[model samples]
Target: MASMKKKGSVVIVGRINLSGDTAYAQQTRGEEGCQETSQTGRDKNQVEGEVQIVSTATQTFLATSINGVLWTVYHGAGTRTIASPKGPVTQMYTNVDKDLVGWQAPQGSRSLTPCTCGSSDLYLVTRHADVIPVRRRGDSRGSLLSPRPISYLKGSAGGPLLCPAGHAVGIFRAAVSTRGVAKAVDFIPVESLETTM
Candidate 1:
């Protein structure tokens, strides 16, 4: 006979400069006077990936693989320490688009509501400090959904998509590549994901 339960045991930047220095491409901010818009605007573009967690809470995180580079930059220099908050990451799951970063929730981080059922007007909290409106395009594909932006966007991976009521849809994975050029962005519905502990 064998009886055993897994026991929890284990544990595990100064990015003043970026390796390629082109990780976050800047986007033009539209003139808007809104709370989330301005608060998110003042937020450093290098830090939007963090807002997802800051707004939501749990043991695991949903993020794009490219955002992993944020870790690289944070450790690149000493001053960056004050610039970015540290989160110990444990690789949980990943595919071609997003990955789950296992992290311990920081106390007092408010939780955002996840869009559970249907569609509505949506906006994205982008890495470059802008929350822009988005429209849903066509139907969903298994686990993925496509949203069309009013204008072409660059470097928006890992950005959080939210409904008008502030319910979160999910994090942006990548722009959909099409026949001529890619315009629509693809994001996995946060509610549809099967989270791991």
Candidate 2:
């Protein structure tokens, strides 16, 4: 007899560092406000590789050729075409969630933590690979979402929101303000992944 149960996991942040540098790239702010614009500025590392649950609530990585790397999947990533080490390659297409941001080994798992507009302990990882911290003079709270997340670079939508204490907490959902000191965002969490299927 054999067991049919199995487990699986994805590429998540492994180590964390705050004193180190950062890696975030800023982009054009929402000139159209909340409305859609013709601007193409974003890169949040939303990896997708046909993920399958290990069938366990706490399943970790099973086996992989890239032993040192993490592997996960995402949405809207329809066979990206780019230069690879061995020329160009295309990932087989599949269905996934668009509301999630992920990374892999040799890649990273930036230290992340819960954020608040008033908490000076918050930081974020931008598309430019820069780690930026946040601080405000009486930084007030916002509406709808909790206390909100830390400030990131301009136009860094779909980026990772880190804690510098451990792992990532949210992704750059949307930019409230593109310029200025504060880079307010529409943060998206791992738990709040929206299903488009």
Per-model RMSD to reference: 14.3, 15.1
Worst 10 residues of 1 by lDDT: 9-18
Local distance difference test, each candidate: 0.36, 0.30
TM-score of each: 0.44, 0.35
* Residue 191 lDDT in candidate 2: 33
**lDDT string, candidate 2, 1-197, tens digits:** 39663212121211122233533222222223111111111223332221111111222111110222222223222222211223223332223444332323222322223333323344444433455554322222112222223343432343445444534444444445423334444454433432211
Listed per model in order, the count of residue pairs whose N, CA or C atoms clash below 3 Å is 6, 24
Candidate 2: which stretches are off by over 4 Å?
Answer: 1-79, 91-121, 127-152, 178-183, 192-197
The regions of model 1 sitting more than 4 angstroms off are: 1-89, 92-102, 138-154, 177-182, 195-197
Per-residue alpha-carbon lDDT of model 1 for 48-106, expressed as tens digits? 32343221111111222121222111111111111112322333333332332323322
The top-ranked prediction according to lDDT is 1
